[PDB]
Amino acid sequence: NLPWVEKYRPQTLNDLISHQDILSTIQKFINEDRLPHLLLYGPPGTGKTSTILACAKQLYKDKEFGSMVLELNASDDIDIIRGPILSFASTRTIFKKGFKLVILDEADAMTQDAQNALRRVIEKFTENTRFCLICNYLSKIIPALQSRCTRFRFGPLTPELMVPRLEHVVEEEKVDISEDGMKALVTLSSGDMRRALNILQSTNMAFGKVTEETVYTCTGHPLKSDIANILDWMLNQDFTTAYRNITELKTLKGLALHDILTEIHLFVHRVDFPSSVRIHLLTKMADIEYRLSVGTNEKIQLSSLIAAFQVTRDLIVA
């Protein structure tokens, strides 16, 4: 049927979660008419677009919503700034009164000159037009452009404030889910609600049941047991057998060296290494992760990771 990401998209201010302070502030601005230009930024899929749509629909009824809110996306592209945006901002309303509204999804994709043009347009008509700029990276925004609007950071969704939302979907979409399955669904989501919903739907389609092993296989993410085994092999087994075991596991389960390397990073900081050993390991793992980006041979990088660990064994034992 309809994918659950929009099939259960929030529709009112009450449906949103974990941002109650931000929603309260925007509601106060709306009620007191002091609504300034809005700069919303954060990790992907935390409900920024849904939040601003909910606020706009609260302020504007659907009869006039189309004629008083110009929703646009930056990746659809400078002519956007000088064209539809300028035309919309350069006239007052059609039916209602008050300020209009422009929502610019994925604002970080605009070029610097385009951002300067947008800044000039915004300053020209700040009285009767308000701009909501939505982006993932704040650093992509020209400092002059971000000096015209209030910045709101939408942090990632903490589990206990996003678990109940998933439970409603489970009650609605009849899929059996275990406790460890739910925990793994939260962990792989990493505060991303869209990711959580997509993983849930893909797991349900693949097997009809949600469990830690099921979701880990569906997403291809390595299991914690596998990472522990790899760490134990590097710390204990000799180089040849450690390489054989790691290569066999990786080719059997289709693991990716990036996820592997991230998980051993987490374990390295979890375990109690000596300070110098930890520094050496961090420097190395950073170097390997850099090497993967340019597109090197993965086998050599994996063996280099093993090498980085294999050196410490004599150092740690002493």
Partner: protein
């Protein structure tokens, strides 16, 4: 409704600009003498280039400013034809002015037009210089072609000192009677980064959000990796305490900050951190390399951890 403080308290005369004092005095001298040559303004954003140019044009032309001044922005079309058609015809346009006055063409964000547009603008600047003057403004001086700078008086602007920012902010506070505290002023100055526009906008937003201005509210509305925590980060890096530095970094990452923000704030703290100059240069170079890695796509937490490790090993 009320105007934004960045406009409600925009200076209207060159006498009330807290920017580079020598350049401001030079602009006042140009306004008095009248026959100002073509001027180019470059520097950090929001230091008052646009305000200075507008005040100069208003002082020079006075009541004739309505029809003797032409202004183009990035919001307008500054294409190869526009400079050939609008600029040229405006230059040819007949306007009677006092002896020391000339038609002023203002091109803010002058760095934004292409190479061809500026090449065409060259001759029009050269020909009609007897009656038309140009007031360019840009953030990066390298973007405008060398002949244009050769036939103009390039006027550099700099990031305003914290004293000037404090004076302007305190003036605005007296205007608005906003309650404050020294910690809030230090925080707003730090968030300003030498930018009057940024400082005023942040102060107005902070006052709107919470009224009384203190460091807590300032960092609440102007959310960023807190400079203090970054200070303990760098201090731990100096003392080679990699574990504590990682603890702070992991706390910041779990707070959800993007790695780009964290690294930028780390470098900003490394500006004023009291620590050995050679070691500070080493740290700056390493942070620059890590920021290279971050900006080109490799933005994992592992990269920041490697940064911390290498900073720890720089002190050995």
């Amino acid at each position: 409704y009320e105007l934004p403080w960045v406009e409600k308290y925009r200076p209207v005369k060159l006498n009330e600009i807290v920017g580079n004092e020598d350049t401001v005095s030079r602009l006042e001298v140009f306004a008095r003498e009248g026959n100002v040559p073509n001027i180019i303004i470059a520097g950090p954003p929001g230091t008052g280039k646009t305000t200075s140019i507008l005040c100069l044009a208003r002082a020079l032309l006075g009541p004739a400013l309505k029809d003797a001044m032409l202004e183009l922005n990035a919001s307008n079309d500054r294409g190869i034809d526009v400079v050939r058609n609008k600029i040229k015809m405006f230059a040819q346009q007949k306007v009677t002015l006092p002896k020391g006055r000339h038609k002023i063409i203002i091109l803010d964000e002058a760095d934004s037009m292409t190479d061809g547009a500026q090449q065409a603008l060259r001759r029009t600047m050269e020909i009609y210089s007897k009656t038309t003057r140009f007031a360019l403004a840009c953030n990066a001086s390298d973007k405008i072609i060398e002949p244009i700078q050769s036939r103009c008086a390039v006027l550099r602007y700099t990031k305003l000192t914290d004293a000037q920012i404090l004076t302007r902010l305190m003036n605005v506070i007296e205007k608005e009677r906003v309650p404050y505290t020294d910690d809030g002023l230090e925080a707003i100055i730090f968030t300003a980064q030498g930018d009057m526009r940024q400082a005023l906008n942040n102060l107005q937003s902070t006052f709107s959000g919470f009224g009384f201005i203190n460091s807590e509210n300032v960092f609440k509305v102007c959310d960023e990796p807190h400079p203090l925590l970054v200070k303990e980060m760098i201090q731990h890096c100096v003392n080679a305490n990699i574990d504590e530095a990682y603890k702070i970094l992991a706390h910041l990452w779990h707070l959800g900050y993007s790695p780009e923000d964290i690294i930028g704030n780390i470098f900003r703290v490394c500006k004023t951190f009291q620590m050995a100059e050679y070691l500070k240069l080493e740290f700056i170079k390493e942070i620059g390399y890590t920021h290279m890695k971050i900006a080109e796509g490799v933005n994992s937490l592992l990269q920041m951890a490697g940064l911390l490790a290498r900073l720890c090993q720089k002190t050995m």
